């Protein structure tokens, strides 16, 4: 009972300190920057071959190779330039919710409702793709696998916790706890030393991969957070929730900078991605179309559209040349 009072006063101290740092909103300082106009983006490629809903997609580090997981139980690696299928990996469980690509192109980790993160080796001497390691230890559905190196991966689950794994040994090196709801997404910072995870408790909190410490927590959303992605400089991140609102939080100021809500938007955000410059905030919505937000003025700088069903995944190449979108209509479209 006494500690409960201590908990409350600590929140008041944080709120007062957080409010005292606020001097001017982001939309008030950059009011003199000229708008970026209309970003009209045209479909350049249409990747077909999936026979079920597409739930995840990750870009290769060379901005040419893609990976996509679907309910059909197939894992396809695409040549994004010539629309050729490089690999086709049959999964054990057809219920895959996330699917990641290694930064070196050697491995691919891709898992889902089976509570297991399966890692596949592409550069094998036998010419086929084999299941190198199956990571187990999560009691809930898996989401947002992210490779750190060729032998280190961070995973998120519905156990209200995320885990840091060692692919060689197979043991859970570090476990990050503190969430009070299913964790739906995570993103790795460019300096590969920090990451943020968005959970169902309407809170995203910054975690340290080396120490396993919740350095900071961020609030403001009214519903569960569905996606997250860092600003390109690794000093801010953007979240997407079922509240049909997008928000930009700053790690140094510990306060949200601006909101990306529009009166015509009803359905929540599914995916969040940034451009190479950090100016266009692309977000996928449940009303079958993606919107491009000017991340500095909260102005809709065009709409992608085109898809027939809910857009479930977004992806921007490392060089920023193209944007890949996946939806439940079993089609991947590449925009530019």
């Amino acid at each position: 009972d006494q500690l409960r009072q201590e908990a409350e006063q600590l929140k008041n101290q944080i709120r007062d300190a957080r409010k005292a740092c606020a001097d001017a909103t982001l939309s008030q300082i950059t009011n003199n920057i000229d708008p970026v106009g209309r970003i009209q983006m045209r479909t350049r490629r249409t990747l077909r071959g999936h026979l079920a809903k597409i739930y995840a997609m990750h870009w290769g580090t060379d901005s040419r190779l893609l990976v996509s997981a679907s309910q059909d139980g197939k894992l396809i690696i695409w040549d994004s330039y010539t629309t050729n299928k490089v690999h086709a990996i049959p999964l054990r469980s057809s219920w895959v919710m996330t699917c990641a690509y290694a930064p070196s192109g050697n491995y691919v980790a891709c898992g889902g409702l089976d509570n297991i993160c399966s890692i596949y080796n592409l550069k094998t001497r036998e010419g086929n793709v084999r299941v190198s390691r199956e990571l187990a230890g999560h009691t809930g559905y898996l989401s947002c696998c992210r490779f750190l190196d060729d032998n280190q991966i961070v995973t998120s689950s519905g156990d209200t916790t995320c885990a840091l794994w060692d692919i060689e040994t197979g043991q859970q090196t570090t476990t990050f706890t503190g969430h009070t709801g299913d964790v739906m997404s995570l993103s790795l910072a460019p300096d590969t030393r920090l990451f943020v995870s968005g959970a169902c408790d309407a809170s995203a909190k910054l975690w340290d991969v080396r120490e396993g410490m919740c350095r900071q927590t961020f609030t403001g959303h009214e519903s569960d957070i569905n996606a997250i992605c860092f600003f390109p400089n690794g000093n801010a991140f953007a979240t997407g929730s079922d509240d049909a609102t997008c928000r930009l939080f700053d790690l140094r100021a510990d306060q949200e900078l601006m909101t990306y809500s529009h009166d015509n938007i009803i359905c929540g955000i599914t995916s969040v991605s940034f451009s190479k410059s950090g100016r266009l905030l692309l977000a996928g919505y449940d009303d079958f179309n993606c919107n491009v937000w000017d991340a500095l003025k909260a102005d809709r700088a065009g709409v992608l559209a085109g898809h027939d069903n809910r857009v479930s995944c977004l992806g921007v190449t490392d060089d920023g040349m193209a944007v890949a979108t996946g939806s439940w209509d079993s089609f991947l479209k590449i925009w530019n």
Partner: protein, 53 residues
């Protein structure tokens, strides 16, 4: 009694953060998006001769 003991401990670390005014943070994010603005093929369309797609 043993569950919320760590809760106040986490809030103790979360309160001792060297915070920065949002005015400075907003300018820093503005500078980065303006500096690395010539290398964005999405904000400014790439020439058709340099478009792999």
């Amino acid at each position: 009694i043993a569950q919320a003991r760590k809760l106040v401990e986490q809030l103790k670390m979360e309160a001792n953060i060297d915070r920065i005014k949002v005015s400075k943070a907003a300018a820093d994010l503005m500078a980065y998006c303006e500096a690395h603005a010539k290398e964005d093929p999405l904000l400014t369309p790439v020439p058709a001769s340099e478009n792999p797609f």
